[PDB]
């Protein structure tokens, strides 16, 4: 579970979001900012919203519930009412394949 198979870097266009469901664990969200990939918990820290259903503006994801937002790279809140940082998960591409860590950084 260290590295989770997401998809081919080819399956994602710049500025898109993908939800990664995990057995017995909370979902993750993978964002493609250009040719780089990032990932955080999928659930907004302000409620029960799914960030994968939000709007990505550059490196900032906006929650579809209340307009709160986070920086997808650091997981830090970017817009109120969000105040709790998101857990960030490492993403690496091996053989044009996208992988996300099973455990968050720290």
């Amino acid at each position: 579970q260290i590295w989770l198979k997401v998809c081919a870097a080819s399956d994602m266009q710049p500025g898109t979001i993908r939800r990664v469901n995990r057995v017995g664990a909370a979902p993750l969200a993978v964002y493609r900012v250009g040719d780089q990939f990032y990932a955080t918990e999928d659930t907004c820290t302000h409620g029960i919203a799914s960030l994968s259903e939000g709007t990505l503006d550059g490196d900032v994801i906006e929650c579809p519930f209340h307009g709160g937002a986070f920086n997808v790279c650091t997981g830090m809140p970017a817009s109120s009412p969000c105040t709790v940082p998101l857990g960030v998960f490492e993403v690496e591409v091996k053989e044009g394949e996208v992988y996300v860590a099973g455990e968050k950084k720290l």
């Binding site: 302000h46 409620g47 519930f65 209340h66 307009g67």
Partner: protein, 389 residues
């Protein structure tokens, strides 16, 4: 229709129409009183969706006219002057209207006026069902009453009894409190729990995916639009509340199973089945009066095959159900609604609320209401529609 700061509506992308519907939804039927409260030839006043209305019974049939003279905007009810069976005359300058179509048919102070027969006072459809008076606060020919009622309310054998009162909170706070799965917690000491040996958990530990938490009804043959709370289908009911691992509270371990089927329907009526008894049902409307108040129209249904059974039911209603349930159980819902007023009063609560799992049910309702309401009531509807080109 701009009832709230645009900045806030822009933030709540999932249910903006709902957040904007501070005055309620127009073009829906709403219960405002019981048939026995309105007698022949005795006009009664009330405010619905911010509009002052007058209801009268003529030859047994109900009629509804807006309680505001077309001339100088006074309420006709200040001094009711029904001079002929089919009309009402304004006490000020005697402009006279017909109850059936609102037409200005006479003006006692000037029978030659060019306004006679050319102006029309607003009328609203009125329909009685199950001893309840429903008013269609909308324009054009009304849809079937069943569209705006929960399933079974209009069943032939369903005996409907209840009470109605005015509560100080916006109608939406009442609705959400009612459909809120986890708010059961505030009823843990209700007398109905012990006095009716109810089984009542403290909460619910969710199970399954988001979609499984509810059943959204937007394909009902009757046109009904609503949501079913299915939290108890995959979850695990909480009967031992703990803090730090230590049990600090327990749910009710009675035998009577109740409220295992809860649903909310537009324009805002909740159905709880079975309740308060395994063989009864509860139907309650949270009717908008103005932005700060609503009618808490409570009704209890129990099948009855004959007048004999209808009395037994009525007696238990008066001596047990109404006292122990409608009040003994639901009174805590009243101050709970009132407790949320401050947080949402400035419309900021719609942005700052921090929801948890069981609110998935509330979200479903907000989305359903936002997508299937028949119109947003506005202050302009109250004062007089405004438009240009």
């Amino acid at each position: 229709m701009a009832n709230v700061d645009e900045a806030i509506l822009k933030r709540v992308k999932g249910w903006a129409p709902y957040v904007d519907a501070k005055l309620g939804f127009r073009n829906h039927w709403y219960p405002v009183m019981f048939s026995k409260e309105i007698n022949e030839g005795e006009p009664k006043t009330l405010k619905l969706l911010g509009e002052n209305l007058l209801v009268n019974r003529i030859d047994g049939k109900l009629y509804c006219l807006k309680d505001r003279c077309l001339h100088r905007g006074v309420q006709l009810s200040v001094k009711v002057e029904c001079k002929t069976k089919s009309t009402i005359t304004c006490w000020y300058h005697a402009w006279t209207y017909r109850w059936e179509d609102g037409v200005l048919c006479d003006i006692l102070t000037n029978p030659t006026s060019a306004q006679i027969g050319r102006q029309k006072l607003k009328t609203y459809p009125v329909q009685e069902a199950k001893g309840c008076v429903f008013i269609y606060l909308g324009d054009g020919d009304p849809p079937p009453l069943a569209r705006d009622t929960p399933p079974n309310f209009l069943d032939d054998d369903m005996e409907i009894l209840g009470k109605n009162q005015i509560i100080k909170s916006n109608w939406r706070l009442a609705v959400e409190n009612g459909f809120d799965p986890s708010h059961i917690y505030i009823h843990k000491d209700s007398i109905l729990v012990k006095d009716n040996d109810l089984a009542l958990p403290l909460g619910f530990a969710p199970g399954g995916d988001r979609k499984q938490q509810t059943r959204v009804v937007d394909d009902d043959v009757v046109g009904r639009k609503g949501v079913y709370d299915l939290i108890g289908e995959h979850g695990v009911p909480v009967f031992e509340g703990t803090i730090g691992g230590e049990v600090v509270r327990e749910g009710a371990y009675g035998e009577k199973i109740v409220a295992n089927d809860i649903s909310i329907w537009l324009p805002g009526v909740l159905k709880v089945n079975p309740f308060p008894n395994p063989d009864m049902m509860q139907f309650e409307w949270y009717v908008p009066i103005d932005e700060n108040t609503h009618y808490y129209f409570q009704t209890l249904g129990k099948p009855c095959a004959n007048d004999e059974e209808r009395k037994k039911y009525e007696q238990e209603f008066e001596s047990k159900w109404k006292p122990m349930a409608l009040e003994g159980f639901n009174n805590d819902d009243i101050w709970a609604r009132e407790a949320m007023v401050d947080f949402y009063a400035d419309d900021k609560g719609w942005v700052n609320e921090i929801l948890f799992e069981s609110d998935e049910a509330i979200v479903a309702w907000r989305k359903l209401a936002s997508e299937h309401n028949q119109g947003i009531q506005t202050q302009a509807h109250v004062s007089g529609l405004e438009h240009h080109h």
